[PDB]
Each structure stands twice: as C-alpha cells, then as structure tokens.
Amino acid sequence: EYAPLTVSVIVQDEGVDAIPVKVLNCDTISQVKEKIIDQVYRPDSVVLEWRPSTAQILSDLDLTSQRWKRVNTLMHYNVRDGATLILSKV
Amino acid sequence: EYAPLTVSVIVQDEGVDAIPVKVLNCDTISQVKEKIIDQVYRPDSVVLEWRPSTAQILSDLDLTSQRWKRVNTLMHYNVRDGATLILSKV
Ligand code: NA
C-alpha cells in the first residue's frame, strides 16, 4: 500500500528551524528531494541524510538498493512518518 | 492526487499477447519498468515506448522533462488508464 507521510527537514549549518515536507512512501529519493526543494526554497547539487546512531545518505541507487538494482523509496530505507532528514548542498 | 492505473504491455517482436501491468500515476519511469519486468518475466537493458501517431520513448529524465530537470512519471507524459506500452530489450 502507498500512503502519505511528513518528514522534518533540517537545512545543514544554516541555523534555521526544521521544515515539514509532505511526501509519499512510494516517492523515490529524487521525488522526495524535489518536494523538499520546492518546500524549503518556495537534486544533483543537494544531499539528503537521515539518522535512524549512524547517519545515512539517501539516494535512488546505492549499495543498499534491492538486488540489477531497484530504485530506493522512503519505504525501502524504512523512513516513517515524523522522521528527521538533513539537507545540505554541493 | 495519486491513483492506480493499468497499462497494457506489448513485448516487441515476440508475437505474444499484451500483458496488463498495475502501476501508479506517481511511479517514475524506472518504477514503471520494474513493475513491468516483474509482471512480464514472473531497466537499463529495457526500453519502454508509448504511441499517443508518433512513438515516444518513456524515461525518467529526457528532453521533455519539467524544467534543473524533474523526474518523469506516467502523469508527466499524460499516460492514462488502459494505455498501450511497448517493451523491447538491448
Ligand atoms: Na513514485
């Protein structure tokens, strides 16, 4: 099943408040990044991280991808409603 | 709004019947291709085409992409419920 969820986005080293972003569990990471950018600034240059003790970079295709490698969604990483994400540029 | 739809997949030059595949309008092309491959054979090596007079290759990122370029979904191309798609390899 596909369903909406909200993530809380921290813009790294900017000292600003976390920004809520409405995303879908079936959104690929690139779709998540586009929704974040649209919201925050109302994808190749930006990095998205999550800390479920060890910080993890979220990407469409990485070494964790379902294995031919299947595109990662928030559902793949098991990112749940309310999760904190970190956005950084360059 | 996000919603399901079924596409009818023709496996090019194999002389076989069209295969129905359940997809989502918010599925990127790579997500669509994965669902097609899972169904047909129960993404980089496969090509997906649609004929709304002129045949068009469907891809995550192409020259038609929303312009930084946003990832294509079936919703982007305006592929509706029942649409015929053509799958070819190499
Ligand atoms: Na999606």
Curated annotation (Swiss-Prot), chains A, B:
Belongs to the plexin family. Cell surface receptor for SEMA4C, SEMA4D and SEMA4G that plays an important role in cell-cell signaling. Plays a role in glutamatergic synapse development and is required for SEMA4A-mediated excitatory synapse development. Binding to class 4 semaphorins promotes downstream activation of RHOA and phosphorylation of ERBB2 at 'Tyr-1248'. Also acts as a cell surface receptor for angiogenin (ANG); promoting ANG endocytosis and translocation to the cytoplasm or nucleus. It comes from the Eukaryota. The chain holds residues 1459 to 1561 of 1838 of the full protein. It is found in: Cell membrane. This is Plexin-B2. It comes from Homo sapiens. Monomer, and heterodimer with PLXNB1. Interacts with SEMA4C, SEMA4D and SEMA4G. Interacts with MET. Interacts with ARHGEF11 and ARHGEF12. May also interact with MST1R.
